[PDB]
Amino acid sequence: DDLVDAEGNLVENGGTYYLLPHIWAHGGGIETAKTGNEPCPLTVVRSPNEVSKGEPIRISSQFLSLFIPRGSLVALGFANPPSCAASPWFTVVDSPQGPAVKLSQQKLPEKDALVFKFEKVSHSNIHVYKLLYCQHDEVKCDQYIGIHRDRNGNRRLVVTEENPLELVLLKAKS
Ligand code: NI
């Protein structure tokens, strides 16, 4: 069995999807934002706008198959990233708020541009998925990407303990 998008159809490996929440009341899709002294928007964050599908995210399995297997690792990159970013792939860097989800200004190695994994959420007509962060075990997926709203309203994506993200993947019109 593989990952299913928010309409029942199999998630197409490499395709573009909007990562929206289970409950639309929780917010909108995932986009970018300029936090810190970033020269541009390099912080992956959720949209405060309940009607915003957000940026279409590209999901690329670790397998070169047509579909993405259930426990497969996946790279997640913005279809239309910001100019300043070297590559369009989400990545995980350390920070005070813990591991944070950000875009990089210089190229990224495979071991960094391939650290996420989707996990099904049991009882739901529609397939919902939590987002895991897998790290270097000299791989271990046992960290859940969640939200952390910073003092400026930014609902950043950062590994958290409570309230992990629960997403539905809606195919984005190419
Ligand atoms: Ni803060």
Curated annotation (Swiss-Prot):
It comes from the Eukaryota. SUPFAM superfamilies: STI-like (SSF50386). Keywords: Disulfide bond, Protease inhibitor, Serine protease inhibitor, Signal. SMART domains: STI. One of its GO terms (molecular function) is serine-type endopeptidase inhibitor activity. The record marks L64, S65 as: Reactive bond for chymotrypsin. Disulfide bonds join C40-C84, C134-C141. The keyword Nucleotide-binding does not apply. Pfam families: Kunitz_legume. The keyword Transcription regulation does not apply. PROSITE patterns: SOYBEAN_KUNITZ (PS00283). InterPro entries: Kunitz_inhibitor_STI-like_sf (IPR011065), Prot_inh_Kunz-lg (IPR002160). Belongs to the protease inhibitor I3 (leguminous Kunitz-type inhibitor) family. Inhibits alpha-chymotrypsin at the molar ratio of 1:2 in state of 1:1. This is Chymotrypsin inhibitor 3.
